[model samples]
Target chain A: FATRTSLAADLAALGLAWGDAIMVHAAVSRVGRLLDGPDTIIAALRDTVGPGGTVLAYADWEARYEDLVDDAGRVPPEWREHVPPFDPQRSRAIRDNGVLPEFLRTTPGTLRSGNPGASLVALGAKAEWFTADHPLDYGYGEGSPLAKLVEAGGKVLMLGAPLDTLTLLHHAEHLADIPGKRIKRIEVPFATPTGTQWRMIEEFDTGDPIVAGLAEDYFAGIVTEFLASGQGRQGLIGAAPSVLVDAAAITAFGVTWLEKRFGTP
Target chain B: SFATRTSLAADLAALGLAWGDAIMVHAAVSRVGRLLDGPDTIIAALRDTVGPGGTVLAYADWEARYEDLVDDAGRVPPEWREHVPPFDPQRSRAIRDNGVLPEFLRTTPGTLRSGNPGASLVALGAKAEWFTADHPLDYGYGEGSPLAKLVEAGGKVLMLGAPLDTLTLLHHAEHLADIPGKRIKRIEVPFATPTGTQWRMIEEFDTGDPIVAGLAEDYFAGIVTEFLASGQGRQGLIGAAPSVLVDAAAITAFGVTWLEKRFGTPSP
Candidate 1:
């Protein structure tokens, strides 16, 4: 079991700087056992970065029929009719975003983007700026929280997470100009000042069964190359392998690789 | 002096186009600001780029298919709407409002147009028929659409003095995008099917709606800006106009990501 101070020391050693905004993707089970569990790590992460820094997480609001339809077909219309609209204050993150995001999203002083499909939550000095203006389509692209993270010269911490779980690459996918890629859209229920409403969500696929047939994991392959190039640092969290990457460097490098490998010569 | 086919072909080669490459070209002939032999010269230049093996695709929609039946002011004087005949790919002129390229390409010898009346596609080359073979009536940009075929064939999109907004392939992305609340409107139009003229139901996004239009405009704007910023595409002069040359599949891939990021459905 790891204590708060011990975890903070480990993260600080992992190169989390003072006042730095960091997007964390974690798998709690890999941390083995925490003194106070996952929130201990979150608390230590906050302590390591200090109040001036930010902790960002991807929070996907599931439990909507609209989301279910694509994954499970043949659900009657009535089943969706009663589904509650999205409320940033009250909604929970989907399971795929992992366990950490759910706790971090509800953490005190967190500013969350209300984009029902791809809500991003941030906590710190610039949380509002970071999560605000997530585009309805390309939510992780030019104007998204992910984009802002890079713009701010922030960091990405892969704590007990696989390299393929790097959702930051989706922002790079949007950043890279790959031709013939598929587009996605959906209607999300939202709780507005007036009443419950549906809003159109549009974007590129973050991951896919749609693109699963592609010959290679371009992102993962490039990420390994990126690490080989010394663009990021590697360490360990408890018994799990971890990495701390410069968001700007990875995104920029990812875009270059995608452009040369996929774009026109 | 107006640019000749030889000069245009040279320009195309300079743009790095190769033989057997399928290309979707958007042009404003006059905006090239000059053409030696008009649209023919432009066609010939492209023909020279890919030779007989390459395919050149263009949007060859029928103008009156919508407006002639119902006036721009929104009135259909019963008899007038009835007199408005169903579209004939072989005879109906391409919308002149789009400029001279489509009409010329549609009427060019050996050219074959797709079956979609409202958003028909015209192609020229040995691969032309394969591209326009069977265009599904609905979502004129999907699997059976000429745009999709072009991408699958590893096509290129050439902008010949046309605005970046003229990228018709993005519409294909719109059709393929799986975002939420994307409005689909059903349209019924008559076209010459294999069994002759038939009225078919075609469904497309509410592109006519002001809200959708604004969002689409913003989306494409981001695409062009980002693509340019990436510096992957080549830009040069076809005539006096600045031209852009991009890999069709590359842009579509990027567009898919863009759409997914901006408008994708929420997930678990």
Candidate 2:
């Protein structure tokens, strides 16, 4: 079982420092038994970051594709009347993202971005600025929280999470001048004075390869290649393998890799 | 590692569970030691024990900080008031104090949640919609509420390694008890509707503290202890955890009678 102190010590040993903003991806169960479940991990993160730093996580809602779009790829007529609008305060983080994001989202003083489809939650000093201006369209692209994290000299901490869970790579996908970058359009509901209004938004094809014919494990490929370049720190956090990398460095590397592989010569 | 769906079902059956029985469960998953699939195994075992005709229920009150709504206390700052999200039945998370089971139950695909933000309940199986539909904001644990409906429908309370003091059904007893000077509180709850958010006022017996004066802080636990001493419920171990199963109406009646006996009837 891991206590807050031990976890914090391990994080600090793995190159985490006070006042450094970080986007975290975690699989808590993989870290072995936690003394207080996810609370211990959260406290450890906060301890390592201190009050001046920030902790962030992706927190997309579990809005079913069928409920949002029909077979014809448009918002269904019946959905407007029946399905409730995505209230940023009330909506739950998608279960697929793991339990940590939802726990952070409900933690007092934490602020979540307004994007219904791809929200990011943050806590600590830089939380407000990090989550303040999330655009509805291209949620993971420029002007998104991912972009802010990169621009702010943030780091990405993979605490027992798989290499493929690297969401920062998606930002690189948007920045890369590659050909055939796929865009998926979906309608999201929002509460308005009149009633619930459905707004169409465009986002990168995060569900699949950003460009066609790429390997399904392309995200893992990028992170593995980045690690081989000796740019990121790797160590054990509890019984789980963990990695910590500079957000800006990894994004730059990913953009170059994507452009070289998929961009027209 | 000690429990599986099959073993848990067998243990539940041995502890007096039956098919077609509607039950409200309070669980402490940690007490069950380790399981093959954790909460999922326990939930599945419950479904297997009760079969298709039964219903599983859990309390899932919204978890947002609403300390300001308790009388004139304003723990929340003025600047943060507008930012405080309104309670949407489907979206708001279950109170963490209730532990992790309620949230897991709330997110279960077939589960239906009650609309009352502060006193919401999640139900699955045959009577889910009936138990969760039209939950009133005022006197939430009283008549016309899900607690009342639970008793009316001959439901049972299952304590799966959870403490007796966590008996939320006793709040219903506090509401029904004819004792004198029962404390009542009025608070405003932010609710989301078709046309933006609205601050709605609701009244209920003060559940934050003892509903009446002169009762022990853990009086709900006391009631459960006394009820168990009377030999009314079945008690056994389910996956190394102490468990109890008792009829909801029987316990509520006992709780009300116990309260009225302690504090005489109200002056008319």
Q: Report every candidate's CA lDDT.
A: 0.75, 0.83
Which candidate number would show the highest TM-score if scored against the true structure?
2
lDDT for each residue of candidate 1 in A1-265, tens digit (9 for 90 to 100): 4556777788888899999999999988887655445666787888899989999888877643543474423334653444456777666677687878966875557778877567888989899898777777778788888888999999999888877778788888787766866677666677778876766667886656123345345666767899999788888877668989999999988888777766754
The CA lDDT at B187 in model 1 is 55
- Model 1 whole-model lDDT (C-alpha atoms): 0.75
Candidate 1 residue spans exceeding 4 A from truth: A67-80, A209-218, B1-268
> DockQ for all models, in order?
0.00, 0.04
**lDDT (Cα, tens digit) per residue for candidate 2, span A1-265:** 4667788899999999999898889998888866446756777899999999999999988665334446545666744544446767656677788998988886667888999777999999999998887999899888999999999899999988988888889899888998788998877777677887888888887888898888877888889999999899999888779999999999999999988887853
Q: Write the per-residue lDDT of candidate 1 for residues B142-161, one digit (tens) a residue.
A: 78888899888999999888
The first chain of model 1 has a TM-score of: 0.91
Best by lDDT: 2
lDDT of 2 at B179: 80
